[PDB]
Amino acid sequence: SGISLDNSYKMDYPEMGLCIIINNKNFHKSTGMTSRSGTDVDAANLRETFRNLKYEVRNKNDLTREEIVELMRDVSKEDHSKRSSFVCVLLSHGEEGIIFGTNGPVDLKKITNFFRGDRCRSLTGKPKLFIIQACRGTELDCGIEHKIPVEADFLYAYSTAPGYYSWRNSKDGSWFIQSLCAMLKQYADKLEFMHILTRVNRKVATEFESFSFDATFHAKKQIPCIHSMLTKELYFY
Amino acid sequence: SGISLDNSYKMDYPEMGLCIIINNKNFHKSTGMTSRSGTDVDAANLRETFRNLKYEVRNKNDLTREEIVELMRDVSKEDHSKRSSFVCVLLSHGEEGIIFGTNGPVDLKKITNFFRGDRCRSLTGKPKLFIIQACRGTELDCGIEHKIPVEADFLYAYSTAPGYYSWRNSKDGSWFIQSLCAMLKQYADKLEFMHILTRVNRKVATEFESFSFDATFHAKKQIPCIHSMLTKELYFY
Amino acid sequence: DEVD
Amino acid sequence: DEVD
Numbered sequence: 001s002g003i004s005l006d007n008s009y010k011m012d013y014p015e016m017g018l019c020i021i022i023n024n025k026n027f028h029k030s031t032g033m034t035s036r037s038g039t040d041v042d043a044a045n046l047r048e049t050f051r052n053l054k055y056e057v058r059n060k061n062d063l064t065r066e067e068i069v070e071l072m073r074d075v076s077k078e079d080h081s082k083r084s085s086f087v088c089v090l091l092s093h094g095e096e097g098i099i100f101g102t103n104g105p106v107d108l109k110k111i112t113n114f115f116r117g118d119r120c121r122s123l124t125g126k127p128k129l130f131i132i133q134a135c136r137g138t139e140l141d142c143g144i145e146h147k148i149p150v151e152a153d154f155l156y157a158y159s160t161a162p163g164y165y166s167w168r169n170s171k172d173g174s175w176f177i178q179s180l181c182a183m184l185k186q187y188a189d190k191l192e193f194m195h196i197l198t199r200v201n202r203k204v205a206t207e208f209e210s211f212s213f214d215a216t217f218h219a220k221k222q223i224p225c226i227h228s229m230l231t232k233e234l235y236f237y
Numbered sequence: 238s239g240i241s242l243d244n245s246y247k248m249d250y251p252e253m254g255l256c257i258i259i260n261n262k263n264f265h266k267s268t269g270m271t272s273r274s275g276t277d278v279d280a281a282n283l284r285e286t287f288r289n290l291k292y293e294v295r296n297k298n299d300l301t302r303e304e305i306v307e308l309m310r311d312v313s314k315e316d317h318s319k320r321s322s323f324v325c326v327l328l329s330h331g332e333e334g335i336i337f338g339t340n341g342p343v344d345l346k347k348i349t350n351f352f353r354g355d356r357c358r359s360l361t362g363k364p365k366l367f368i369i370q371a372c373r374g375t376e377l378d379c380g381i382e383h384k385i386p387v388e389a390d391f392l393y394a395y396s397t398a399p400g401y402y403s404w405r406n407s408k409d410g411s412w413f414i415q416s417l418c419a420m421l422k423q424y425a426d427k428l429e430f431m432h433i434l435t436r437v438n439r440k441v442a443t444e445f446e447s448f449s450f451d452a453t454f455h456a457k458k459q460i461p462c463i464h465s466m467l468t469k470e471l472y473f474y
Numbered sequence: 475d476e477v478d
Numbered sequence: 479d480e481v482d
Binding site for chain 4: 274275329372396403405447448449
Binding site: 007116117118121124141142143144145146147148149150151152161164192194195197198199201202205206209219221222223224225226227228229230231232233 | 244353354358361378379380381382384385386388389398401429431432434435436438439442443446458459460461462463464466467468469
């Protein structure tokens with residue numbers, strides 16, 4: 001047999017894999033968290049987008065901190081042997097390293113740990129992708145004119161830079177998700193995932209700017225952040 | 238003129254740009270920080286590697302926290318107009334978000350801020366690359382068998398995952414740097430930088446494992462981490 | 475426009 | 479092998 005190259009994840013398993021979409025819109029009153037208008041638009045876009053990539057999409061809405069954890073645990077214990085990859089999309093309130101259940105927060109690290117190389121072996125060596133639309137703090141960008149590591153093969157696609165707010169439009173959905181779906185829709189059959197994510201960075205960075213009656217929140221910008229510990233190139237085809 | 242595409246940083250300015258290499262090997266006794274054996278090997282490899290990419294390399298050894306800051310400030314105030322890109326390589330002790338001067342620590346964010354879109358305008362819209370060989374904590378991986386955002390166009394290439402130790406060999410140099418130079422040497426004229434960094438992830442993840450007489454530090458693994466807020470593809474040619 |  |  002002719003010479004072979006090994007630069008890309010094997011994405012030709014019988015299944016592309018799960019796409020779990022956690023859509024938190026409505027929060028228990030006691031948390032003091034606002035209702036996240038527009039997030040349903042994000043959830044629908046993602047569902048359709050990842051449907052077309054041939055992912056087995058599971059939408060979950062309005063989950064408690066307990067339900068998020070139990071869900072992630074249960075999913076990490078499924079047999080992923082026939083699956084190429086895993087995708088988990090989190091839409092909620094957040095702070096740095098944290099996303100909100102409807103009744104309180106969960107550590108991102110606690111969610112991702114379920115899928116570590118040593119804790120879910122049917123996903124070992126396969127790409128584990130986490131896409132997070134949530135704040136990472138309260139800063140505003142004013143813009144300017146024989147063994148593998150257990151943390152290997154994780155990619156975290158953050159909506160925003162570390163420490164910063166992330167922006168969501170109540171009508172159109174969040175800047176990040178809408179841009180992400182557009183680029184997946186447009187480039188998933190021709191670009192490796194990092195270059196797709198890089199077009200998402202540019203789209204968000206250049207095409208969006210906030211409008212507010214409050215000068216503190218007006219004319220602000222956003223740059224998403226790619227957190228990659230992938231060891232191969234990922235192509236959805 | 239024929240149709241044009243705008244997916245890659247313009248890297249055909251008269252100059253590739255600066256490559257600043259901060260090589261901290263020897264630390265004031267009062268800090269209690271060990272001497273970083275092997276780091277000179279890293280500094281030499283990087284110098285040669287970035288020399289061949291046509292960067293204007295400046296090596297600095299054993300800088301105080303004050304000197305690091307004053308250096309970064311001074312460099313950010315140079316006229317970068319004729320330069321395509323900026324590169325800063327930090328070799329030292331570290332913790333999460335921090336690198337060590339010889340006499341104490343500096344915030345990574347304080348170094349990178351000098352180069353924000355709004356604070357160094359001759360680098361606005363151009364790639365600003367920070368390569369960090371330093372610990373990010375004390376965890377060990379046991380392995381398993383009209384405006385742009387001011388934070389846009391930054392890339393941070395971390396030697397290790399968040400929260401984790403990073404490994405350096407006293408004879409051969411650090412796993413990360415040696416792998417990085419090898420892949421730059423081998424792929425800089427054919428791959429975009431993210432795919433180069435992805436080969437670095439794999440090389441580090443698969444080819445290295447620690448050997449220690451202390452069972453706590455023996456047979457440990459490492460995965461570097463790509464922190465990208467780039468808005469375009471970067472090719473060194 | 476709202477923040478998350 | 480040493481840690482930084």
